[PDB]
Amino acid sequence: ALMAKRLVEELERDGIVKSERVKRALLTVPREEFVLPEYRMMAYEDRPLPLFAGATISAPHMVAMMCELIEPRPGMKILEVGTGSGYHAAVCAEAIEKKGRIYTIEIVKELAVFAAQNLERLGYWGVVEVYHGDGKKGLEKHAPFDAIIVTAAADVIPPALIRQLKDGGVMVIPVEERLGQVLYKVVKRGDKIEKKAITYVMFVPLR
Numbered sequence: 001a002l003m004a005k006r007l008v009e010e011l012e013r014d015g016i017v018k019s020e021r022v023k024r025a026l027l028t029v030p031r032e033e034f035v036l037p038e039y040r041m042m043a044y045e046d047r048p049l050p051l052f053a054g055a056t057i058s059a060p061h062m063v064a065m066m067c068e069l070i071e072p073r074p075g076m077k078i079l080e081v082g083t084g085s086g087y088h089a090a091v092c093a094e095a096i097e098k099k100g101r102i103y104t105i106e107i108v109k110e111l112a113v114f115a116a117q118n119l120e121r122l123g124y125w126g127v128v129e130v131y132h133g134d135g136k137k138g139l140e141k142h143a144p145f146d147a148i149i150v151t152a153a154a155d156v157i158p159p160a161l162i163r164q165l166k167d168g169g170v171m172v173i174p175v176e177e178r179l180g181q182v183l184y185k186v187v188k189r190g191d192k193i194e195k196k197a198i199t200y201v202m203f204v205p206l207r
């Protein structure tokens with residue numbers, strides 16, 4: 001509790017957690033429950049903890065930046081690309097106050113089994129849905145989406161996710177450019193795109 005209270009306050013003064021709604025989600029969400037038992041001690045630390053199969057639980061700053069950028073409001077249909085631990089998915093679920101749905105796709109079958117497991121241990125099942133598949137393809141079974149969060153570094157923006165984005169929809173996609181990856185925000189204006197650039201992020205590449 002105290003480590004969680006200190007973390008989100010530290011984040012607030014840095015100017016990451018601008019929204020109170022985003023902050024409440026961070027405080028509510030136990031990261032300890034998404035990390036593997038050994039990393040429980042370091043769960044509250046603001047760095048990407050290691051996970052099996054190349055996955056890494058995205059740092060609490062990386063998660064607050066993406067939630068902040070998708071403009072969280074209740075009743076959102078959200079597509080999280082690259083579930084991993086599913087920690088980001090629970091944070092988006094609290095940000096929408098459990099009203100709506102978090103659809104989350106994962107290339108690794110093993111990883112999807114672990115994320116879905118943690119999401120049941122806390123009560124996110126139903127609100128959050130896990131799929132074993134391709135992030136580039138996306139979920140056309142439930143599309144269009146209010147927010148799409150790409151928790152992996154694309155070489156180029158997949159066109160299958162811009163089209164799976166509904167009118168007014170936000171997509172926060174790390175794109176691997178020169179001198180590193182740039183966190184990008186994409187805004188859909190009916191038929192027009194708005195590719196806006198934020199900060200230089202460190203993310204695992206997209207398959």
Ligand SMILES: Nc1ncnc2c1ncn2[C@@H]1O[C@H](CSCC[C@H](N)C(=O)O)[C@@H](O)[C@H]1O
Pocket residue numbers: 053054055056057058081082083084085086087088089105106107108111133134135136151152204205206207
């Ligand atoms: N093409 C692809 N489609 C779906 N998932 C992918 C992918 N390429 C990589 N991934 C997965 O995306 C994950 C990145 S880790 C993201 C962790 C997440 N923000 C959290 O806190 O839960 C890894 O599990 C990796 O296997």
